Amino acid sequence: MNIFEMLRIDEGLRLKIYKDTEGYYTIGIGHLLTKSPSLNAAKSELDKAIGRNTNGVITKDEAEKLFNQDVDAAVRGILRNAKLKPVYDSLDAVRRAAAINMVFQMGETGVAGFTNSLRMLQQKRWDEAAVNLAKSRWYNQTPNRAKRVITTFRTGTWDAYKNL
Ligand SMILES: Fc1c(F)c(F)c(Br)c(F)c1F
What is the effect of changing residue 20 to C? Predict the structure, then answer.
């Protein structure tokens, strides 16, 4: 298990434009195209991302290319964020993956409200952190995925994924 396999489980793989859990146009391995309700706007974003005129369908290779870029972008975003970098630096590699997972799903704007959780994670108060993380829109809207990510933060193991 690693961040790539982990996110592949959580996001799936679809080669045609689909709507994510929030109703937003997405493709590949959870590559958000746009929050716009316009399919044409989404197709434009896709074309721009891939570098060719696609009309809504990509190859597995192309999906994996965007996925690698997105994982990279998530890590780089954490390291450039003053609130996130210290907590990330304080973590072991397994829990770092859980961190990347969250940023991948919600972005930095989505994780802005996790200040108290972040403190508890840096303190390594794993059970308390886990309890706090679940008190969120995130957990309520995507409970099964949140549960996996939280278990990863709680235990520092891949137990929530090793079976999947
Ligand atoms: F949601 C979270 C993040 F987005 C994050 F970057 C880190 Br480090 C965390 F520890 C976390 F809980």
Answer: Nearly no effet on specific enzymatic activity
- Please name the residue whose Cα sits nearest to atom 3 of ligand 1: 99
Strands (E), the chain: 14-19, 25-28, 31-32
Annotated active-site residue 61? The verdict is no
Residue 98 CB-density burial (10 A; 0-12 exposed, 13-18 middle, 19+ buried):
buried
DSSP string, 23-37: S-EEEETTEE--S-S
Helix (H) / strand (E) element for 88: namely: helix 85-90
Q: Please report the domains of the chain, with CATH numbers, ordered by start residue.
A: 1-164 (1.10.530.40)
Measured from the CA of 95, which atom of ligand 1 is nearest? 10
The answer to whether residue 127 is catalytic is no
Write out the two tokens for 1. Answer: 């298990």
Kindly state if the Cβ of 17 falls inside 6 Å of ligand 1: no
Nearest Cα neighbor of 22 from 34, 10, 14, 6 is 34
Measured CA to CA, the distance from residue 25 to residue 19 in angstroms comes to 4
Residues 120, 60: Cα–Cα separation, whole Å: 39
The tokens describing 122, both together, are: 């840096």
What is the distance, to the nearest Å, from the Cα of residue 83 to the centroid of all Cα atoms in its chain?
18
C-alpha triplet 100, 8, 118: angle, nearest 5°: 20
